[PDB]
Amino acid sequence: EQKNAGGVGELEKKAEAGVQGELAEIKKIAEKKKDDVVKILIETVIKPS
Amino acid sequence: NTVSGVNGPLVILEKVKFPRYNEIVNLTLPDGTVRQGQVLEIRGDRAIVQVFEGTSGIDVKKTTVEFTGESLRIPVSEDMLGRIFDGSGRPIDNGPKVFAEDYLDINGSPINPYARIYPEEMISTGVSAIDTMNSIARGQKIPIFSASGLPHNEIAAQICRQAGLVRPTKDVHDGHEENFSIVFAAMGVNLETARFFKQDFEENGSLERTSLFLNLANDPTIERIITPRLALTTAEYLAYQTERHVLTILTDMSSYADALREVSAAREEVPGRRGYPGYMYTDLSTIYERAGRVEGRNGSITQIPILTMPNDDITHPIPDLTGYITEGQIFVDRQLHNKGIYPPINVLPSLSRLMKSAIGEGMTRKDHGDVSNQLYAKYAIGKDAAAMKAVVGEEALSIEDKLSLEFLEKFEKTFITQGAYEDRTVFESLDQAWSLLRIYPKEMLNRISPKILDEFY
Amino acid sequence: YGAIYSVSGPVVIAENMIGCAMYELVKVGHDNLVGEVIRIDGDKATIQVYEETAGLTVGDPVLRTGKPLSVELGPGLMETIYDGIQRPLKAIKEESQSIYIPRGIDTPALDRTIKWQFTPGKFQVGDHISGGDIYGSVFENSLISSHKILLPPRSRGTITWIAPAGEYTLDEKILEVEFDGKKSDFTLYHTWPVRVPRPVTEKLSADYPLLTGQRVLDALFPCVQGGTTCIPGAFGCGKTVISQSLSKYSNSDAIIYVGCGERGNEMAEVLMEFPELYTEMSGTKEPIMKRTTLVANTSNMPVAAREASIYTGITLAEYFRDQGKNVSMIADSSSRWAEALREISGRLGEMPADQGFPAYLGAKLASFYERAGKAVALGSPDRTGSVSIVAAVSPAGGDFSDPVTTATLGITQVFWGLDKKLAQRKHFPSINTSVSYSKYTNVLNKFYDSNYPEFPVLRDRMKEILSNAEELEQVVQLVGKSALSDSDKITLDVATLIKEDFLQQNGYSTYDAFCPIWKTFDMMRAFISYHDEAQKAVANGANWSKLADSTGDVKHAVSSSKFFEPSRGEKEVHGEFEKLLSTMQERFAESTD
Amino acid sequence: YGAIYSVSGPVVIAENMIGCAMYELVKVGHDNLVGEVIRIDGDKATIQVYEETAGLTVGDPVLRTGKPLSVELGPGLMETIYDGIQRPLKAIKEESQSIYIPRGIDTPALDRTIKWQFTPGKFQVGDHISGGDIYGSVFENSLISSHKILLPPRSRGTITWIAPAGEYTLDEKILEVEFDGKKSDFTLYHTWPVRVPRPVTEKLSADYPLLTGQRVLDALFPCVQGGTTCIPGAFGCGKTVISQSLSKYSNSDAIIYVGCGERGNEMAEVLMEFPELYTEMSGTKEPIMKRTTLVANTSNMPVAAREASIYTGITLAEYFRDQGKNVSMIADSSSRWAEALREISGRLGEMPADQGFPAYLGAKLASFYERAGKAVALGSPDRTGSVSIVAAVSPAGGDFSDPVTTATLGITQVFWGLDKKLAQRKHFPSINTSVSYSKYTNVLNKFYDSNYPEFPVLRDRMKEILSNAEELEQVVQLVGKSALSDSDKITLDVATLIKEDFLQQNGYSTYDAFCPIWKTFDMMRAFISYHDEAQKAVANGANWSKLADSTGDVKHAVSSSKFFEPSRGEKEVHGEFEKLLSTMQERFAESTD
Amino acid sequence: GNFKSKLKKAMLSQQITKSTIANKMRLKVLSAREQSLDGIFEETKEKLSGIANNRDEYKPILQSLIVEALLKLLEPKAIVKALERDVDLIESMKDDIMREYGEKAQRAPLEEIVISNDYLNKDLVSGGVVVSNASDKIEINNTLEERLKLLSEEALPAIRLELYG
């Protein structure tokens, strides 16, 4: 039980560590093609959505 | 234009008739609120709308409307798994929304490509009393019908936790080769109970693979009736796109009936059979068309709907239509529950139509269906023999009744009694059947062929 | 055209309608959805648009076809699966990538792209023709020609052009008729409004057998070609099974399978099963499916399909009757049709009648059964054809007191009940003497008598033995068996053997699913004979117990006869049943002793 | 605002509503009777006016109150008898000289005689405050404070004016909060609409019991607080009696008493008995009455007040759940309550549904039980409360299978019966082991086991003994005593001692009405120890009569434990039970030998 | 025997933790995806203000927003609400709006454009119109912020799939 109230912290270290690679490719590929989606957003907005 | 008048949660709008059916309307009220609705009716410069939010707090000529230009279609993703939702598809954990990757109709089936190859390969749930006596297939719909005051929800929990601990041993035998996911719909289900279903999903390993939809009866009727359809669109999308068997646990069927009943009284409809809607068929049927194998025939939606009997009768319209549209039923009997049997699955009327059309070979015996026929027929005979024992007394009874009396007693405490975190294999149930069934001579065992019978009694 | 005034649920009102009838087919909107004008109130006509009205834009045009809802009669119906509005579902699979119709579907109401083989008949140029006359044939049955091509009813004349043999499409004209000038050219198919029956010269007195092939059903109350049958069903009653039996075993040249809004999983099953099955007539190329045409619809698949399903499926049976074919039309399940009238009255705003089901229910059902019968074919060669209706219904009140069962029963000539108590003991199809009759029985048993059986006498006795059994059983239950003769036990004992052995016949094989007239005779003959001999045996000395104990294995020998195939012995009578008579007589002497 | 268009019976129709919410509270005409706008068609509203319209004319104005039908819940709720629209009835008695209200006259919902002492919370000048955060507190009785003033839900901001400590009136403001401009002014009370339930951070699964201390209630089918419970009645054959018992033995932070629509002799009785009674926690100042706030409607008093009654109670109760108070909610009766709805439905001219009772019924019953339960209050402090709803029902139409009762058993997790014979014998609640169940038991036995008790093992055994006892008596009738022996005879005897000690109570003593968790644990420990050792002793050679006579002193002393003080071994711990274990061992030696 | 039930129970508490952590884990992956998606919309709307503040590039856009708005009205008289820097732009193209509207419907051109004395937020709202009927009870909020917000509903599935599928 002691490993179910103090060894469940390390299980949460391991959930933090596995997404710091994701939170960074998220920002990579969002930043590149950001500009290409805006152009589609503008022609669409000034016409019917 | 403005709200002309409002009747219960249907609102009479005066508005131009150009909008298409099911298009969202937004009423801008002077309270600051925006409330969303669906045109239930379009008429000549007027509409009848069901409001999503609310049922009241709606002004006459001070309230105004705006059109979306968009039909009611559910934004469905597969990023909605591993997260807890309300009955209208929004997190209650208040984090990022459902979002979409498609929009799918709930007003009519999208693709409708159901089964041209009969569901025929077995699904095991770890229960002898279910799986043997009623054969489950990938796309088949068998419902659990229970009575008021019973723990319908606890039996549904058993089904969830043991299904998916069977699957890797079943994977070897052939019955899965694909991801398994749960789509769980509550209408009219208690907070406590819901919290039990989440715990069930933790145990199994499919809290990450399930979507939970919670509507309470203290949330509008209009939200409540969307909740099963939202469940179905979610479940057929996983099933379609990445070829997954989704098992749908839809509790409770009468709670859904209840809401239909209130927007019938509020409609210009007359209620037919016993105060329930005269279009009660169309409602139920919308749910049941979606179930069966979907395109590519490695995706499916399998249904166990849960019904609690509102008056505790099997003459009441709800179970009677529902039973006709579905393939069989599983009965729970009150007398069992009180005695402390678990699961209290009384097999006296429990039968599933596909029994020799839900089995094959290489994972089931072909004898599997045949064995079921002995078990069901003897159970009944036994049940009759016990009825005569109660009246006449043993001395009066003949030899045939005594054997059968004995069979019945053994059946209750051994077959339908098993643990609640205890899995079973279909092979294993049949071997247990053979011993118990072995209490009669060959003259009397004649609901199975002499070849199979000679081997095993 | 028309202009859509309101779209309210699946009810649509459009104003500015002209030339509209009361069951006229219309296509609604720019989508062109299936609809039908139900009523007209002033200039505005209420049309129920029953294929998904979702996303229907209002102020679109509504187009009249100028005629009511129809079916297409002619080549390609066999080995092809349709819906109840008569659009081909099979066509939809290749293009849409969908089994059932969604919406936007505007495919023609028959496949007419394909070619079928035209053979001229016995008509030549300058020869006279009249409707229902056999102008040629197309081979599409298991063994015979299926789609025999007719001059459409209500035309006569002399044929100016007879095209010779060869392959042509549906579309291509190959016939010209002149009467009072050019009547029209004719093509391989014709159309016919479904809310009107196709004409006949005359209907004939049904008097010939319809084999069902279930032992129990044929025994107690056998069917005829041209009968009407009512069956209540509560799910799990083995409905599918008896339906499957009929399509194989019946002596009818055509089976039309009708899904009146079903599960879909159940429709797939029967479908898949038919090509594997082999015909008893030495079928080919998907043997049984070649004699099968499927109307298959799904539960919430368009309410136009469900309502129309029964009318379209009987119209197809009638075309076939006019060529002089025997058809068996199995409607499955018409309870759902009854539910469709419940809905049609409520959505429209009409008031219904007893128990929320309208009274228009009753007339509309009666018209449907009357289109059936045994018949002398339309057209001048004269042949006999049949449309024989066997229709399931169900409760709706969890009784047989509900308006649905009782109305359909009012009209019917054959009644085959439903027994929940017997169903538990594993009996299907479960019937009882007290819940079934056939007014055809008298004439039918005489017919069966000719073939070899002792059938008339045995049927009288079959009724009596089960009716006496029921009364006795009430006293045994309540009072006891110990206040009652050994003899009264005997009636129950013999009766039990009949209960398991007849009634359960759902089969786990073809051998346990098929029961010819000879085999049905044989099993009944051995049980009555046992009764007569047993009562003697005990009466001159012999206890009950000793008799029960002694016969023992013999009770079983008849029990197992169903599991064994009927192609065995001399013909269709087992050597096991032949021996069984000697064994019976040999047994009475020992029991008595 | 509006002009009356029409008056048809008790329904009033008023035109020229150009904005009016469909829950809006209204005063109609110049009589100024209570009404609420049920529906609206156009500018004509349907308003049900819940008092008589004798003297009301068409052509009189209807002035909107400017807010929906809501109730203010403040300090001073305690020691007051109210309607469901909330009018103080004691006040009416003062002025008019009657406990019933005069129509066309209303009075302020909360008393305005009362002034209460406000002391500041912890948010001071310019501090940010957020929903459910405690802005102050007010005394709600002299003895104790209980009404903590939180910031209203749906508000948040910075507090620009915080009044200093002192006594203020309900009328006068104390706080203004700024978010988007001055958002509005706040008072010591807050309003919350009656059909809108107050909010929480999240709800929990209750595992916490009631503080009733009713021994059979605790042990056999454990009381839950944060639960839903259905109790049979038939009126004054025990059901009102138990509600009065429940009030007495209980010592919850608040208790809210709801007479949904009772006989009015019963409402009078609740008011008078309570201030003479004593709280079982040993508090003072009209004891039970001080902790009870009473919404007491007889069925004669308007139908608005009957329907609003449950609503007003649940919203009030839920707020107390947000305050961090454990509430016992007693409703009497839901059968009456379903009837309030059916009445309204027929007047208006809408169709009611199943059994003549409305469509809206089921959703309304259901919402009500699910609203009650254990939660952590809204806001940063996160105090724990509970709302336990125990609703009484009787037969309605005289059948107890009708929709109302049957709908409610399905929702319930707790059932405790009532029987006329058991009620005569002074067993209250009148329960056995099959007229009662609890599915809350599982979590609850787990909760109690943690506290120190050996509870789960002992409780299961309690149920078993009662079940067995019943069963051995039937055998004595049919089979005889030949199937009876002394082992069985001890089983009957233990059940008798368990019935007398647990089931029978009526408050003969003060120690017969509060018995702690630890005391209840100790009674069941004596009786199970007697059982197992009596059986062992008769097996090594002893007789029932011999065991009975021999156990004697101990047997007498443990039956009488309810009359005996529960402060004997400390304050909750009873010394006699601890000394029983040793006596029992020496005793077992006397019984065997 | 009973060690196994309680061991199983604590072993169930062990995967109870395992799931709440693995759920929060994907809730972080998903809420980052949106933080960036709503910075694509952040770019869009800086563009929308910059164009709105043009008076020559903005006219063919503005006209099309009033014209489209009129097709989802279809009423004889319309009142058009705008920002006080777009009113002069409406004023110099009225004839063009009643024409373009009349051409795109069966209906004969709009009688009157009444340039409303109501004013939309200058802070929150940049360009576009609220087009309304004669009585002002039907409104199409056909502003640029609004149109972006409505496009987000359907634009979103397309973008989540190409970047993230």
From Swiss-Prot, chain A:
<protein>
    <recommendedName>
        <fullName>V-type proton ATPase subunit G</fullName>
    </recommendedName>
</protein>
<comment type="function">
    <text>Subunit of the V1 complex of vacuolar(H+)-ATPase (V-ATPase), a multisubunit enzyme composed of a peripheral complex (V1) that hydrolyzes ATP and a membrane integral complex (V0) that translocates protons. V-ATPase is responsible for acidifying and maintaining the pH of intracellular compartments.</text>
</comment>
<comment type="subunit">
    <text>V-ATPase is a heteromultimeric enzyme composed of a peripheral catalytic V1 complex (components A to H) attached to an integral membrane V0 proton pore complex (components: a, c, c', c'', d, e, f and VOA1).</text>
</comment>
<comment type="similarity">
    <text>Belongs to the V-ATPase G subunit family.</text>
</comment>
Curated annotation (Swiss-Prot), chain B:
<dbReference type="GO" id="GO:0006874">
    <property type="term" value="P:intracellular calcium ion homeostasis"/>
</dbReference>
<comment type="similarity">
    <text>Belongs to the ATPase alpha/beta chains family.</text>
</comment>
<dbReference type="GO" id="GO:0046961">
    <property type="term" value="F:proton-transporting ATPase activity, rotational mechanism"/>
</dbReference>
<dbReference type="GO" id="GO:0046034">
    <property type="term" value="P:ATP metabolic process"/>
</dbReference>
<dbReference type="GO" id="GO:0000329">
    <property type="term" value="C:fungal-type vacuole membrane"/>
</dbReference>
<dbReference type="Pfam" id="PF02874">
    <property type="entry name" value="ATP-synt_ab_N"/>
</dbReference>
<dbReference type="GO" id="GO:0048388">
    <property type="term" value="P:endosomal lumen acidification"/>
</dbReference>
<keyword id="KW-0597">Phosphoprotein</keyword>
<keyword id="KW-0926">Vacuole</keyword>
<keyword id="KW-0547">Nucleotide-binding</keyword>
<dbReference type="InterPro" id="IPR022879">
    <property type="entry name" value="V-ATPase_su_B/beta"/>
</dbReference>
<dbReference type="GO" id="GO:0016471">
    <property type="term" value="C:vacuolar proton-transporting V-type ATPase complex"/>
</dbReference>
<keyword id="KW-0406">Ion transport</keyword>
<dbReference type="GO" id="GO:0010494">
    <property type="term" value="C:cytoplasmic stress granule"/>
</dbReference>
<dbReference type="GO" id="GO:0033176">
    <property type="term" value="C:proton-transporting V-type ATPase complex"/>
</dbReference>
Swiss-Prot record, chain E:
<keyword id="KW-0472">Membrane</keyword>
<keyword id="KW-0406">Ion transport</keyword>
<dbReference type="GO" id="GO:0007035">
    <property type="term" value="P:vacuolar acidification"/>
</dbReference>
<comment type="function">
    <text>Subunit of the V1 complex of vacuolar(H+)-ATPase (V-ATPase), a multisubunit enzyme composed of a peripheral complex (V1) that hydrolyzes ATP and a membrane integral complex (V0) that translocates protons. V-ATPase is responsible for acidifying and maintaining the pH of intracellular compartments.</text>
</comment>
<keyword id="KW-0926">Vacuole</keyword>
<dbReference type="GO" id="GO:0048388">
    <property type="term" value="P:endosomal lumen acidification"/>
</dbReference>
<dbReference type="GO" id="GO:1902600">
    <property type="term" value="P:proton transmembrane transport"/>
</dbReference>
<dbReference type="GO" id="GO:0016471">
    <property type="term" value="C:vacuolar proton-transporting V-type ATPase complex"/>
</dbReference>
<comment type="subunit">
    <text>Homodimer. V-ATPase is a heteromultimeric enzyme composed of a peripheral catalytic V1 complex (components A to H) attached to an integral membrane V0 proton pore complex (components: a, c, c', c'', d, e, f and VOA1). Interacts with VMA5; the interaction is direct. Interacts with VMA10; the interaction is direct. Interacts with RAV1 and RAV2 components of the RAVE complex, which are essential for the stability and assembly of V-ATPase.</text>
</comment>
<dbReference type="GO" id="GO:0000221">
    <property type="term" value="C:vacuolar proton-transporting V-type ATPase, V1 domain"/>
</dbReference>
<keyword id="KW-0007">Acetylation</keyword>
<comment type="similarity">
    <text>Belongs to the V-ATPase E subunit family.</text>
</comment>
<dbReference type="GO" id="GO:0061795">
    <property type="term" value="P:Golgi lumen acidification"/>
</dbReference>
<dbReference type="GO" id="GO:0046961">
    <property type="term" value="F:proton-transporting ATPase activity, rotational mechanism"/>
</dbReference>
<dbReference type="GO" id="GO:0000139">
    <property type="term" value="C:Golgi membrane"/>
</dbReference>
